[PDB]
Amino acid sequence: HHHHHHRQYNLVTRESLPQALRRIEEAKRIALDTETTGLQIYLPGFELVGLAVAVSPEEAYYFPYAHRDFAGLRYQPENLSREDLLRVLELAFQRSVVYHNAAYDRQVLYRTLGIPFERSYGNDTMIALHLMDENHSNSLKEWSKTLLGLEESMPELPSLTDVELVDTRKYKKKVHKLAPDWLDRLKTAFLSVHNGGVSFAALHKLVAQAFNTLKARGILYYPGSFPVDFRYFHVHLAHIYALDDAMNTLALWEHVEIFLQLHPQLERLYLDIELPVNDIMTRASARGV
Ligand SMILES: Cc1cn([C@H]2C[C@H](O)[C@@H](COP(=O)(O)O)O2)c(=O)[nH]c1=O
Ligand SMILES: [Cl-]
Ligand SMILES: [Cl-]
Ligand SMILES: [Cl-]
Ligand SMILES: [Cl-]
Ligand SMILES: [Mg+2]
Ligand SMILES: [Mg+2]
Ligand SMILES: [Tb+3]
């Protein structure tokens, strides 16, 4: 685990899974966010990579499911099993659930884990916030800046290699070696711009920059460019990104229930029309629109 400015980020492992279940079980309201291989849920090869679960706006659990190590480096933790994630989801759905874009997450959970839409149903900050400000962007990062007061951030990577002089004519050649602490150096570059709501593009820029710097120094080789694939994003960085989405969604929900209490006209519009219609459209895409 890691505490970064009032927020507790927990990376779940097989060992720490029972504590994560104890914290979810204790929560009256949770937020769910899915991390995946792309925006198209119905493309062959689509996968759920990890699940973010916030038990409060300052406490969350990341459940790695299909993360992988890229270009021969060793940095990912051990992924949790399908049964482990289904235990998490059985527990999660026994309390109130909040999403930011429930149509995406619920279709991901159905397609990849077979979670019925009946259990999946929950609140959606993206729908309720559209009733607060119709002209505002649907982006969770953008709404976090507006209501939660997150600072603007739109990544300067340190040297991940140490130069060693190696006896080789009769001279000393400069050979770059991967620094033993390269992961802590990479986390430091990430933390120096971490505002509590770092964007996907920014996370990918740093991850890509990390691998490209190592490829440009002969440390590793991969054919082509660095893929826009969350499976390869270093979990010790990516779990912070994913967990902030879950914590921002729950923090935004606190603001939403205040707004809906002051406007029961919009609360009724949200509960009787918006959320049910969105559920209808979500189930229809899962069959084929
Ligand atoms: C924001 C974004 C997300 N995605 C995919 C990967 C993410 O793991 C998944 C969930 O997005 P999220 O980070 O907003 O929850 O959607 C993209 O493929 N491109 C994007 O620009
Ligand atoms: Cl895609
Ligand atoms: Cl695996
Ligand atoms: Cl169903
Ligand atoms: Cl040389
Ligand atoms: Mg999401
Ligand atoms: Mg996310
Ligand atoms: Tb309420």
Residue numbers in the entry: 0 to 153, 157 to 170, 176 to 296
Paper text:
The structure of PolI_G20c was solved with the aid of the structure of an exonuclease termed ExnV1, which was determined in parallel in this work and originates from an Icelandic virus metagenome collected from several hot springs in Iceland. The gene coding for ExnV1 may be part of a truncated gene that originally encoded a DNA polymerase I. A novel structural motif, SβαR, that was not previously associated with DNA polymerases I was identified in the solved structures of ExnV1 and PolI_G20c. Residues 152–185 are missing in chain B of PolI_G20c; however, the residues corresponding to those in ExnV1 are present and from the sequence alignment it is interpreted that PolI_G20c also resembles ExnV1 in this area, which is part of a novel structure motif (SβαR) that is discussed further below. The major difference between the two proteins is that ExnV1 only comprises the smaller 3′–5′ exonuclease, whereas PolI_G20c also includes the larger palm domain that is responsible for the polymerase activity. The SβαR structural motif consists of two β-strands followed by two α-helices that are connected to each other via a short β-strand.
The gene coding for ExnV1 originates from a metagenome collected within the Virus-X project. It has a length of 942 bp (corresponding to 314 residues), and sequence comparison using BlastP and the CDD revealed that ExnV1 only contains the putative 3′–5′ exonuclease domain typical of DNA polymerases I, indicating that ExnV1 may be a truncated DNA polymerase I. The crystal structure of ExnV1 contained one polypeptide chain and the overall structure was determined to 2.19 Å resolution using the co-crystallized terbium compound. The structure of PolI_G20c consists of two polypeptide chains, A and B, that could possibly be arranged as a dimer according to PISA structure analysis in CCP4mg. ExnV1 corresponds to the first 315 residues of PolI_G20c, and superposition of ExnV1 on PolI_G20c (with an r.m.s.d. of 1.01 Å over 236 residues) shows that the structures of the two proteins match each other very well. The major difference between the Klenow fragment, PolI_G20c and ExnV1 is that the latter two have a separate structure towards the end of the 3′–5′ exonuclease domain, corresponding to residues 157–222 in ExnV1 and 158–223 in PolI_G20c. This specific structural motif, termed SβαR, consists of two rather long β-strands in ExnV1, followed by two α-helices corresponding to α-helices 7 and 8, with a very short β-strand 10 between them. ExnV1 was also investigated using the DALI server against the PDB. The search generated 13 matches with a Z-value above 20 and all of these models are Klenow fragments of DNA polymerase I from E. coli.
